[PDB]
């Protein structure tokens, strides 16, 4: 199966672009990153920073994760992110999303050797 690190890159990294430039970005990316094959994933965030910059977050401020686990890390700097939120009329298989671009601190859960992001927890 996909490694946890590779799954995080597929589901949450978009280093190719600095921001989402179209209101259809989430419709396109949720589909193209295989997040709508099994069901419409209701919410997902993509990070528009280099992989190195996101991996570096695992060496930044330790915080709790929303589920109460304690291996989360908050970025020192804000990062470009796109939040994808499923619309009210969305119905599988035509999963439809609202795209919101913002510049916020991110919180990721980190694991492994090398110690890298494995879950996207939150932004603030």
């Amino acid at each position: 199966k996909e490694t946890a690190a590779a799954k995080f890159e597929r589901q949450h990294m978009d280093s190719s672009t600095s921001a989402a430039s179209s209101s259809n970005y989430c419709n396109q990316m949720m589909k193209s990153r295989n997040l709508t094959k099994d069901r419409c994933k209701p919410v997902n965030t993509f990070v528009h920073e280099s992989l190195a910059d996101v991996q570096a977050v695992c060496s930044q401020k330790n915080v709790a994760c929303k589920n109460g686990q304690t291996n989360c890390y908050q970025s020192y700097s804000t990062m470009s992110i796109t939040d994808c939120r499923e619309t009210g009329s969305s119905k599988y298989p035509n999963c439809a999303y609202k795209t919101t671009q913002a510049n916020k601190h991110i919180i990721v859960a980190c694991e492994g050797n090398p110690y890298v992001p494995v879950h996207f927890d939150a932004s603030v």
Epitope: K61, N62, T70
Partner: nanobody, 121 residues
Framework: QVQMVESGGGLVQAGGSLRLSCAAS????????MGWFRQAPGKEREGVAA????????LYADSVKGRMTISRDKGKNTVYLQMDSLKPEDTATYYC??????????????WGQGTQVTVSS
């Protein structure tokens, strides 16, 4: 960049008490969890004890519970392991770890190099 230091091991005798000490420096925040893991020759690394920054959330491996005590300085990235009566089965390399959750090895991102404890019996 973070300096993880842990110490206190060496050649020791069955029945003795032993204290291992660990500290992180070069980190500008607080590690919520710190703990101790160990690996005996030819065996899997195993969790020994962990504790959170408030001095709670304490957990021990079943085979060491009641025989060793973890502690931490409040407000600090330090952790300690007080071993009450060394057994032969306690021979291992002991590692301190920081920044994870409970005794989940993969969740910890900072590790000391390990201090060898060899128990004679």
């Amino acid at each position: 960049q973070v300096q993880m230091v842990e110490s206190g091991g060496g050649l020791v005798q069955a029945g003795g008490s032993l204290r291992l000490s660990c500290a992180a420096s070069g980190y500008a925040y607080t590690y919520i969890y710190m703990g101790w893991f160990r690996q005996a020759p030819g065996k899997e690394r195993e969790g020994v004890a962990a504790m959170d920054s408030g001095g709670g959330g304490t957990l021990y491996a079943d085979s060491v519970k009641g025989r060793m005590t973890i502690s931490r300085d409040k407000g600090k990235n330090t952790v300690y392991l007080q071993m009450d009566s060394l057994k032969p089965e306690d021979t291992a390399t002991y590692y301190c770890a920081a920044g994870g959750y409970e005794l989940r090895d993969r969740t910890y991102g900072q590790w000391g190099q390990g201090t060898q404890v060899t128990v004679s019996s």
